Structure formats: structure tokens, C-alpha cells
Amino acid sequence: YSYTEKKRIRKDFGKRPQVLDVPYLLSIQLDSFQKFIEQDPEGQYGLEAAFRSVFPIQSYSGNSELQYVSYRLGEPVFDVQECQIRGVTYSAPLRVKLRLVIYEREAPEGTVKDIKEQEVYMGEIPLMTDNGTFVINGTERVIVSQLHRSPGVFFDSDKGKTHSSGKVLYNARIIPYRGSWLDFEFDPKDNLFVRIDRRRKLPATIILRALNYTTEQILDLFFEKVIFEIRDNKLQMELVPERLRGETASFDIEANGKVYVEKGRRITARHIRQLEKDDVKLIEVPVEYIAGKVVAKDYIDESTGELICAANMELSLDLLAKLSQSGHKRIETLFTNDLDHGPYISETLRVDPTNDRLSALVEIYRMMRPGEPPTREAAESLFENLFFSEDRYDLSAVGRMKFNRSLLREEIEGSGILSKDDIIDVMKKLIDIRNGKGEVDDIDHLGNRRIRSVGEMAENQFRVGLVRVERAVKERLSLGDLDTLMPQDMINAKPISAAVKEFFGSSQLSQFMDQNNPLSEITHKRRISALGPGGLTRERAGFEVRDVHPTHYGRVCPIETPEGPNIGLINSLSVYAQTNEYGFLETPYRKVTDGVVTDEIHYLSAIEEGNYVIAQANSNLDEEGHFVEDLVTCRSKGESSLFSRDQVDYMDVSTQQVVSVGASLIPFLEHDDANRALMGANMQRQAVPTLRADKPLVGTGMERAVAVDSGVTAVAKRGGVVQYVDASRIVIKVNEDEMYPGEAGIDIYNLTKYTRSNQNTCINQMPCVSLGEPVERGDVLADGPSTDLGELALGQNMRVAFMPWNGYNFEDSILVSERVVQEDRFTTIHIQELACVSRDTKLGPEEITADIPNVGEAALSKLDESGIVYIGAEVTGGDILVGKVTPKGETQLTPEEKLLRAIFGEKASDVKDSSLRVPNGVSGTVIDVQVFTRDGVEKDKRALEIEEMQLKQAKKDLSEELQILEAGLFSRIRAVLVAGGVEAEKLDKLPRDRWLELGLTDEEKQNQLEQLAEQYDELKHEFEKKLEAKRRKITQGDDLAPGVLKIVKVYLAVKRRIQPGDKMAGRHGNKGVISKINPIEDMPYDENGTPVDIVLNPLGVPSRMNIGQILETHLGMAAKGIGDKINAMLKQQQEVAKLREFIQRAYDLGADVRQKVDLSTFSDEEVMRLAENLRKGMPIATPVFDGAKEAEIKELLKLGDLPTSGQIRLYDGRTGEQFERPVTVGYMYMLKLNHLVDDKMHARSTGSYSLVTQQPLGGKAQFGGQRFGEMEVWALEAYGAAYTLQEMLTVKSDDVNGRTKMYKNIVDGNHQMEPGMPESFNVLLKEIRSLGINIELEDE
Amino acid sequence: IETPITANFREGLNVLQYFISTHGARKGLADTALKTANSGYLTRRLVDVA
Amino acid sequence: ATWWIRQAITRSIADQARTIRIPVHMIETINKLNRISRQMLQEMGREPTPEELAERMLMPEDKIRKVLKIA
Amino acid sequence: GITKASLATESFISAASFQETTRVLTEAAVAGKRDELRGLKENVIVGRLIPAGTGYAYHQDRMRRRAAG
Amino acid sequence: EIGRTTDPVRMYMREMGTVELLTREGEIDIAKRI
Amino acid sequence: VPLDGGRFATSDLNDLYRRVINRNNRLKRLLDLAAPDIIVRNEKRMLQEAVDALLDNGRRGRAITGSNKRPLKSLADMIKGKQGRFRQNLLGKRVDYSGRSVITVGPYLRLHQCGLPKKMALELFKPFIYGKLELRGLATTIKAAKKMVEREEAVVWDILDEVIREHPVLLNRAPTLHRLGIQAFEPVLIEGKAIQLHPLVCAAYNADFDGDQMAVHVPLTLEAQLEARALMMSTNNILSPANGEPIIVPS
DNA sequence: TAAATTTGACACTATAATGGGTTAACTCGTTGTGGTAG
DNA sequence: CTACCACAACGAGCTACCTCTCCGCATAAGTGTCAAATTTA
RNA sequence: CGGAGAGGUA
């Protein structure tokens, strides 16, 4: 155990010994973008691949080319926090070394005339933060992966679309990574057709002819030949015996002297076997057998010179007689059957009206571009560019692999374009599927869907920008001057930057981050969206793709998805699920060998998983040897069954590998229903962080991993001893073994204090380590917003009794006591940012001043001389934040105030009130004021003071950084010199800074001494340079929007407490709303006198089938009872041995628990600290599907001196009577969701109106009115409610005269209406008249 | 499916039975929204006709 | 004929391209600005500032004139 | 059917507000139809009292003033 | 042919393409006629 | 119309009209210029395409897209459709004097009472409070009443209690499937931010207390008040209209 | 209003340049053509 | 001559509410007289 | 004060 968990050890009830640790939860995004950025010259990934795929480029002649050399990313101008503050993209400049070589035309190959190379600047690609996040325009964005259909070939069939026949129609499809599509399909008459790019249909032999194939070659490729021989006016065939299966003998199958078949007998398999055992080859036939057969090859007479019969025509008696009298003794015919060898190619050729290649090109031309006069070269160019061009067709080597796998080839590589053999093979496979050999492919099968991450998408968009700039540069280079034109002067950086910025700012996948707690960020980055560019839509999906497929086992969680219209399109990646090199999803498996489950782990894809036999994770083992039982439950080929102990091939690595991160944090998931588990997993990521984070008593053990890997805490990079602890920063001194002889060995962790998050929540970093503590690497030093000693703490654990109470818990409603609101357990902090912009109007600039007219000193008590509220002043609704004032305009000026304008001064009545105020209901202090200005205008006294404070803080903290690091360096120098020699008093009798000139003979230790001195000099130099750079950066003016003078941003900090209307929920989907805050004296109290804090409703248990909450309640009571015993012992101050005994006894209580913790190793101080940390209750880890059982929880209840049933006797606090039945009581972990009544409630009497329809606006932010929809109109109609309907249609809505008359009359007390014609009706009349159709209100 | 889910919600389910029940849970959840939309359309048409 | 055809096309694009009609001289200046910006963006590796464009643009034009020239 | 009966209603405004507005409006324009405003939806659209419940009598009164004069 | 098409650009190019190009001297006689 | 950033946000109809007028003017120019026949034929064809795109974009052929690569909204699209004039501005309208809030359970009420919060009640009855304040003589002008209710004296609260007495309000929850989705209740002033419903009416509303929300409307005229009192009161519609059975049942 | 001046409009560039970019390609019922075969 | 089928095209898809971000994107050659509407005293 | 895109609640 490390020292960060010795403080508080969570008891684990799991029994399966985990072999594989939980991997880094943010591996997919980081790995993808690392591949995109990093230079891989062999495995071309990202920028290098696109650069090689576009460069080099020729001219239309070929006398000038641009050769790629290398590329490099510049250092970003601003930091992450700087970009967030300034609202600019955190990007890195891309500089590429490009070489232009010029060729002579006089020489055959004059390659050496002039070479010009330099660093061209193109584009500013955004960079990824250490937590997988992008910073665009100040906001923080996340790019989610996409599960899209793989490139390759997919055979499918429609399950009886044509209801008249009921036949099964098969269709093939060739999906490339980029290019045109291709669809082979059938018809009810069994003919095969081609659809190009889902256009109209043609007979598919058109493609064959376009590939330069004639009819004889087509028949040779598809149909195999039967040989008919005419000799002396009689007919024989060459017969291969394995052909008369399932057919009826039309003639007598005879031999030279043997009789086999009679009339009206089917050739059964035993007769065929007799045929192979008699060894006959030549079989005589009558003449009517040929009638019905089709000739394979054309036949032309050598004498007359014309074709009697070409390929593919039905032979008859007259035709065979003519051919026999012609003199062709050998006839090749196609072999046809009705069950295995069907005549489809011949039928398609018959329906085909095209003779040879050029007619096929004309026909495909008339398909692709109808209405245009065809030409030979145009058709040839279009057909060669549709499929056989390297720029308009590509499978990207992953479509090639699936393509060769689905056609049962061997190599997994090849060309990126289609070819003749590929088309022949795919259509042959389609024919075979039609015949009966083979099976169609599944669409939802996880072997056909690929994960496209951020790196691939960014590479594709960058390649689009590259082809745009490439087409431009190729056009410009071919005609302009060639000698004095630098390579950087043609390339415009605009298209590439536009492409990357569009992708990173306005895509369907680069979305706003949900970061109200670390769990939300983690479950947002591990997200797979089936929609997006090249994906499905909410209309393009039915029940087939939304539903769970058996191949999702271990790759995709089945119980984490939005429950609205995105029920199956937004999936969550599993825990151990990695990604393949091609993008497929693979899972770990423990490899078993002849019965022993070895620790070797293999990663298996979806197609390989169905081959072997996989054992379940809940199978018991003997000393990590063989299985216990003989018949183990296993799964194979998508179905589960029983198998022997020697037939297995793999075992599940752990029982947690099926569920995702979010669903694995819910204790007792195995008892909950699927629906309520889904709801709990969905609501766990909306929990607002509270004021003081508190650990859950019943955990799972995954809290630590989620907290550490979320990148929200402050993990220690290198272990050591903490040197200086503060509320703002941590100074740590590294150990000797983990420290480079170059550096000082001092690390500084800065802590973020009260920064606004995306969802207006506060983000704070509270240090958890105290002064003088040895901490190793991987230890948490500062807890984030929802972390407690490195464990995710989303909510608070509270006392709960399950009992109905006077109707206040009626339908999921929750009654809460006053202890919860007094102790501010659910009091949150909301930091809200308000912005005021000083626009440059058309009559003068907007000034910010304290001289606001028509306002007294009562509203200006918070404003300073510059008109900005002081930091720290508490502000209420309607108060003035900044005193921005704007001119009105000559139109808004009245003649009365125009006279005094030129007499009493211009600054008299020219301006009006346009100050920033507080939205109603908002309160709280001011914590931060940022004043951004335009470069060129003097700001005010306030902004000068702001920048003075900024420079002072920067210089102070950066100087303190230097001082601490140099103190550590001098300490290292002292340690090194005393490791060399013996000098103790002479160092401390001399100034600390003068510890460098002392020395002796030169050796290695003197060498790192000199290296340390050099690092000191470089340290102070970098100090000075970064100080100067920071000063210049802060003294310069920001680049604002055009027409903007200055922007004032004010941060308010509201403190929100709970009130009737605030939603709460547990972790088992038992959501509810607060109904009443109850005084503590009325609460039902137990025998001891402790009142229950919250009273829930029991009826939500049976109907929703979430028993995990009851078991969690009992487990929480047991844990809190043990913790109460510990607290009582500590308060009595008994001993150190007794506490050690009791804690050890409580730890080793499970039956076959995985962990083994022993208290003899721990010292007395560790025991005391542990007991102090457990005095509030012992945390318990309950893994999903492998958690504690009823016997264990009852043993815990017995140890803690609680009734085993979990139910205690309550007394009514209001009256003192005893409740007739025992009531289940225990501690449950409740959250506080982000649906607050403050943000939900809204009211409006009369406000602003729209322009076109002139009815009141809609929205709380813009003070709108509620819509009275069509359904409610029908309801009032059904009542017969005429007058209310009329008043809601005319006078409370878009009728200008009626509503102002209504206001005037109600102000006068008379309650009467005067309706009028609504404006929307006249809008409709004018629109329909503009349609050109005369409509009018016909009087009478 | 041939083999049924033998265990109840008190004894706790294993991995595969829970995985099986997810199918019905998701199908019902989607059918709820689909039938809601269809009922809304039918109600609109019926209100119009009469 | 090429001169006349190009002149007619560019004059047509200078009167009917946008919702709001801008005079031909202003459109020429807008380009006299677009090219300069691109030239300077290529030369320096970053987008120009208004003062740099004032320095490089013209003898009678200053920061305010071209600031007004930006829409 | 319900859709066809609703579209074939004698009032073109109700049909236009229901479905297939283009076709219904074209048919009404070519036929030179006219609306008598007898349905509840028509008066909801135009902005008068519905001929049902409390307002019904008023409409009847209006009718008995339009017919008798 | 004059059939299933709706793009004005396609039709315009179709009628435009029925007229052949002029040589170095064809323009001379055309200008002489003018 | 201009926006807050100085930029304008015009309608697509301006673009369509610009197209049509430009092509018509150029046709007139060519006609007076004696252009060849193919030229005037092309100009006439594009004029026809401008016109029909104006009438309805995606009807004849390819829809004319604007700058953001989306088809433009024609007059026919502003007439018909789910978001057209008929189904979004003539049948259903946005209404003044309307509020919205989350609901909790009130067990001490009757069938004809609803617990309205004080702030929503003050905002809804603002013209009524102005009128009664003016009648009583505590305010001289409408502006004085505005500022007085804006700083919420106790006399304002007393007059608000006087105004709401025997003044029913309509509670409404969407989707209103059947006619019982809207009902008239007498208001009772409560401190808080949630409308308190009666437990028995939750079956008619199909309303659960898990965060559900509903809207409040205020009848203004006398006919509307009697309309809500005699026809819409929760004590009148006891039996369901679908079948003759009571709907207010213990649950 | 007389006069200034930056805007606004229109007319004119004389080597030879000769056919354009492109997007994405459920389910269901009703209506109208377009043959089809005997 | 006209009873019949298979394609193409068109119109349809609950309700209400809340939050956030985006919308003159890669492309373009300058001079020269004449009128004229906004600008100083 | 508009329109699109993304997400969330009932």
C-alpha cells in the first residue's frame, strides 16, 4: 500500500483476483492526436501521409514541381489559460520546408536548373491539452469518435420486400473510403443489375463490356462448359458425374452396353455414386436434350463466312441441324441448373441491348450525366475516373483488408483502386450467395464498424485543404513567371486554415464540453457517436441499429445511452476496450492452455471472438490452476451454452469488462433493473459539486481511477518530500533516486482557484497533503471539485428512513429535514460571467463612466471613479455593474433637449442609460473584473490599476518560483560538495548565494557541480527572458472584434442553497424533487434520539424494481455503525492496541475477499490517522457483479451491534407515539442534480415583441411568454370555452391595438375585451397574395 | 430464447442474464417514443375530421 | 476580345454580387487590401494589423480610413 | 378515410391549415370557392368566437340577423 | 437529344457546341463582311 | 434588421427578389440591345427559374441554396409546413400573462385550490395591482405604481392578496392529451418557488412529482372569469368525458 | 448659395489564351404514365 | 381497344421548455476624364 | 427579437 491510501483504506468485498489493471481512461483521444502530430516516416500517419499523398505536384506540362522536405510545429504564442482568458484558439504554427525545382524544356530531362527551398507558413493547427481537450475561441471543446460503416464489400438481402412474390433479393455493395459507390443487385425475375452512386439501373453486363470483355469471354468467366459431340448423325456428351443432383432424368442415362436410368426417375445420390464407381465418361443422348441449352461460343463457317449462331442464344432443332450441316463437330454449351447453377448471366446478356465496349460507355455516360451529347473521349475519361483513378477512388488499405477477407483471399494489402478481378470476384460471390453457398453479412456486427477518432478526421480535413491549395498552386504555377517566384509566394494559407477551423469549430462532432464534474468529462471523452458526416441521422435509423447486438459484449456498454431520441446512436466505450490498428474494437482475454488459466492476455476483435470458446468471468479457479466444475458456462458464435473444461480457449479478464465507466460506479448493479440502472448512470453525470466533498460509504473501487485519470487533481510527477504547502501552490522536493543530476530537484504544482467552468459551476483545487509528508510518485496532492483524497465524491451520504409521511412523499417526492440545510451539505457555488461591450455607434463611441443620468447615489455606491463595481462588493438584482453610457441619436433627440445641447454643453442630454445590471434573482459578491481594450486608445484609471496588479502578481509569483528553485539548487550543491568532501561549518559562515566558488581538485563530482552552476546561470537567464515576455504580453492591447472599443467582464459568485423544487437522486435512478423542509423536532427519531434527515417513499421500490437502493441502505447502516463504534472508542481515548484489534477484526470479515490488509505493519501514528479517518464510517468497495452478498452485510451489521434485519423502531417526532412497524433505516449516497428551481421558474406580464408576426418572444433569457399550442386550443375548444380562447388568441397575443387597450383597461379596473384581427392573419394574406393568388376577406 | 433468466432481482443476476434483459429494456424504451409519436399524429387527424 | 470579356464580367461581379451594392472604386480598394493582407500574411507568418496595413498600403490612407474601408 | 374526408371538406381554410396546403389552395383558387366560416377551426383562425358553448347563441343571433335582413 | 434534362447550363452548352471554331483567316473574312 | 454586432440578418425573400429583378432587368437590357436568339432564350429560361424558385424552391428542379449551402425559404415554405404560418402563428400563439414553474405536492389544499408562489403572482397581476393601487389613492401615476411594485412594499402584498381573492387561474401541462389537461383553480399565496398542486388531480393531469413543470395563465375579463368558474373549475369536471367514471380517485 | 472635393460612373487596355464543379446515393401510401400481350 | 402491372414522384411523421455556439469562409489586374452630392463661411 | 447545428428535461 502507498501512503495516499494508508490514510483511509476502503474495505473490498470482491473475490475475483483482478489480473489486469484498469488502463488509462483517456487513451483513445491522446493516442489518435499523437499519431496525427508525430512524424512517422514509414507508417505514414496524419500530416506526413497527406503531404506525401499531395506532394510532389507537376504542372500541366511537367517543367516545374514542388518537392516536400519536412515540417515542424511552432511554439504556441499563448498558454492554455491565456487562450481561455483572451478567447483565442490554442494553436501551433505549422512551418514546412518546401523545395521548388525548375526544369528546362530544351533539354530532354533538365532536372538541375534552379532549386529554391524555404519555410512556408501554412495553417495554425490547434493543439490538444494534456487531458484530451481542445481550446477553440476561448471555449473548451471535445471531438468525439465516430462508429461508421467500414470500407469494403457487404453482401445483403432484403427479407421479402416485394410482398407479391415473397422471394429473397440479394444485393452486393462496394463501399470505398472516398469515391463513387457501386451496387450489384437482383430483380424478381432473377437478373443482376448495377447502380452507380445509387442512380438508375442498367443490366450489369454493361460494366463487363466497359472493362473490355466480349460475350464469349463473359460466358467463359462465369459459366463452365458442357461438351456436345456430333458424330455420324448421333449426339453424345462429355459428362462430369457430380452434376445430376436434384434434377429429373429427361432422357435415358445409358452407357456403351449398360442401362442405368428409366423414364420418370430422378438421379438420386446413390445412382451418382454408382456412376463414379463404374467410371463412365461419354454418354449418348437423343436430339431433344439440346433444345433448351444455350451455346457458349460463337460459330462461323469457314466457307460462307457468316455466323449461324453467336454466343448466348437458345438452341433449337433448326439451329442444331444448320450447325451440323455446317460442319462444326464440337459444341460448347453453358451448364445450367435450377438449384445450384442458375442461368443469370445469360439472362442479363439477353435483356442487355449493348453489343460492345463503346456502346456500354455511351450508356453509362447517359446514366451519369443525362441530357448531354455523348462522346468517345468523355465516356472513356469518366469511366476511368469513376473507379480506376488514384485521386477519385481509394479504399485506404482498410477497405482492401476487409475486401480480401470477405472474398477469401490471402494478402491483406494491395492497390487502393478497384480492378477487373475485384469486380469479377465480387459478382461471382454474389452469384454464389444467390445459389446457396455462403451467407450474407450483418450490418450491426462489430466486425464491420470502425472507430474514426479525432486524428483521422483532422487528417482528412487537412487533406481537403491541401488539395484546395494544391489545385490553386498548380493553376498559378503553370502560366506565371518561373524564375523569381519563391515557393512561398504561390501557396495561400487561407484555404487550409479555413478547413481546419471549420472542422474544429462548426462540425457535428466537435462539441461543447459537459464538465460539471469529472465523471461527465470522462464519460464525454469516451463517447462513440453513430451520427455525423458520413454517418446516420435520427431519421435514417430504425430499430435495427439502435438495438443491442451480441458482439457488443466487452466493446460497447449496453446500459449507458441517452433515453430520448438518441437511444441507440450515442454509445459509451467499455472499460478495458482498446482500439485496433485499423480501428476495430478489441477486448482482452486470458489465454487458457490445457486447463490452466495463464496470465497471458490476448486482444481479440469481433470476428475472432466468435471462433473460439470463451469462459465467463464468474468461474472459480483452484490456486490459479484448473477450473473447479467440469461443465463451465461459456459463449461462442454469439450464443451462450455449457461446455467441458477442456474445450475452452479463453476466459474473461474481469467481471467489470462488460460495463462502462459510468455504470461501474453504481453499487449493487446486479440487483437493479436495466431501466433504472440506465437512468442512474445517466443522472450520475449531472451531479453538481457541493461545498465540501464527501466520500461515499458504499463504493465500487473505481472511484480512485476515475479521479486520477480525469486530469482534474494534482498528481505528483516525481516522489519526494513536500517542502511548502499553501492554499495556492505546492512546493515539493524530489527524492535523490528520481532526480536528474541536471535539475535542482524542486517541483511546483500551481492550483486553480475559483475558475468558471463551462456549465457556470466553480472549479477549485484544495490541497490535501500537509507540511512534512513523504509522498511517492502517483499520489494525489490537491483534490479537485468533486474529489476527496483521490476518490470521486459526487454527493453526500445521509440518513434515510423508508416510510410514507403525510403525503409529502407522494409520487417520487422527497421530504428533507432542516439539518441538511443548516449544515450546508448541499450548498453550491455558481460563478456567473457578465460581459459589457462598448460598441462604436454611428454617432459616437460608447463611454463607460460613473456619470449615468437619471440615477442617484443609491445605485452608484458600488461604482468607483471609472464606473466599475469594486471587487468584493455584494450586489443584488437590478444594481449597476459597469456604467456604460451610449449616445441616443438625432432621431431619439427631442427639440426640447436639442436646445440645451448647444447651450449647457454637449454632454448634457445626448446620452442614455445602457449600463450592465444583474438579472433578477441573482445576487452575490464580485470576484473578478477583466478590462480588455483595443490597441490604440487610452483605457482609464481602472484598467491601469488592473494591469499594474497583473504585472505585480506576475513578477512576484515568477520571482518566488525562481527563489524556491534556486534554493533547491543550492541545497543540491551543498549536498553534492559534502558528498565529495567534508565541509560543514565553512558553508554556513559564508552567504548562501556564495556557495559556488568553493572547490578543490577536478573530478566527476566537480563536473556535475559545474553543470549545476551552468544550470543556475541558464535558470536566471530564462527567468529574465520569461519575465520580459510576460510584461510585454500584458502591456500590449488585445485584438478585439471590429467596431469594439473595450469590453468589461465581471464575475459574480452566487451561493445556492436547497429549497422546495430542487431535484435530487440516488445512484439507482430513484430521482425525486424536494417537497418541504421540515424542522428537526418533527422528524421521526430512533430510540437513541438521532432524527432521520430524509424520509423517502417505499412504493418506488416494487414498481421500478431497483432493490440495489435497499441493499445500499443496509450496507451504509453497517458501515456507519462500525464507524460510530470507532468514533466512540476514539472519544473515550481507550488505547492503541484495542483500536488496532477492532479495526483489524472489522477488516477481515468477508468469506473469501480478495484483499488482505494487516495492521501489524502499520505503526502507531498510522493507526491513529486511520482511526481518525474512519471515525465517520468505514468505506466499503462493492464491485459490480462480484459484490458482497446478504450473509456478509448481515455479518457486518452484527459486528457493529445493529439488528440484522436492517429495520429499527422509530418514534413519531411530532407526537411521540411508536410506529406500528419497524422501518428500514440506513445511510444512502444522494446527489444534487443541476436542474435548480432558480433556473427553471420564470414569469412575464408584458415585454418585447417580434417583428414579423408581432407576438411576444420566447425564452427565459429574453423574457418571453409561454406558447399556447394546438393541443391546448383543442382542449379549450372541447370545454366550449369561447371567451378564454378568444382572449388568448387576440388580446394576449399578436394584436397590437387589442393588447395595449387591454393594458389600459386593466389599469383602469374595467375587465372587458375589444378584439381585433391578428397580425399573423394579415401576414398570411400578404404572403399568399405575393404567391400571385388573389385572396380577400369578402364582406358578407 | 431457450434458456430463461432463472434468478430474481433479490438473489442478484449474473453477467449474461443482465445482458439478455437489456434487449427487452431497450426495445420497450424505444417503442414508448415511437407509439407516442404515432398516437399524436392519429389524434391530430381525428381532431381535424370531426 | 479577352480584355472586353474580362472587363464586362468583373464589372458585373462588382454591382450585383452582394445584397448591398458597393461602388467599383471601393471594391478595387477592398482587393487592393485583400492582396496586401495575403502578401503580408505569407511574408510574416501571421495576419497583419491595421497599422502595418496603413504603413504598407498607400500614402494618403491611414488607420481610420482603412478601418472605415472594412465594411 | 380520415385524411381524405378532412381534405374533401367544403371549407378550404381548414384543409389548408391541416395538410397539403399547396394543392388545397390551388384547387380553391382554380375553382373560385368561398368560405362561409361554419367550423370551429375557421373562427379560431380568423379570431372570432367559436360556434360552440357560450358563444354558440351569439353566432345563432348573428345568423338570425343575417337571414332576417 | 432534346429529352430528359433540366440544367440550363447543360442545354446552353448543347446548343453552343453545334458551331465550329474559326481559323486565322475565317475571322478576317467575317470582319471584311462586317 | 441589424443585430447587436452591427451585422444585418435579412430574409431569404430579399435574395429571391434580387435574383428576379436582376434577371428581368438584364432581359430588358438584352431585348433593347438586340442580342442573338440563343442569348435571349437563355435569359428567359433563367428568368423563369428565378420566378419559380421565388414561388417555391424545391419544386421544379434543384433548390437554389444560399450562402450556408442550405435551400432558401420561399413564400410557399412560409405558408405550408410544420413551421409555417398556419400551424405556428394562427392556431397556436405565444400568450402574455403567462408563467411556468416546477410543481410540488400540497396535502392541505382542497380540490379547488392551488398554491401559487408570491413572486409569480406579483408579476402576473401587475396591471391589476396598478389599477387597485391607483383606485385606493396610494399612487399618483402609473410610473409611481411601477416603481412601488418594483420595490415590493408590504402594502403591495396586501393589495395583491385582495386582488387574487376569488380570481381563478388556469394550470396547464403539456402534452394536453385529453381535455382535462387544463383546469381552473383558485390561487392561495405561498412563499417559495413551486406551484402546489392537489394530490387528487394528479391522475387527470397524468402528472408525477419528479421534476415535471406546468404553466399558469390568468383570465382577464368577466366572461373569462365566469367561464373558468362555472365550466373549468376542478370541482365540476369530476367524471371523465370518455367514459362515465370518476377521475378524481385516491392513488 | 458659391465654391471644394472626395464619391460615383463610364470608357478604355491589341502576343495568345477555345466545353464546368458535385452532392451524397428509413417507410408508406397515392397518382400518373409507359408500356404489354393477345 | 382496353383491363393490367411496374416504376417514378410526392407528401407525412407528439408537445412544451432550457443551455451553448455559429452566419459577408481558398481563390481578384490597374488607369482616366466627367458629373455630382456632401462639405466650409 | 432571426435562422441553423449540438446537447439536456418532462
Ligand SMILES: [Mg+2]
Ligand atoms: Mg414527470
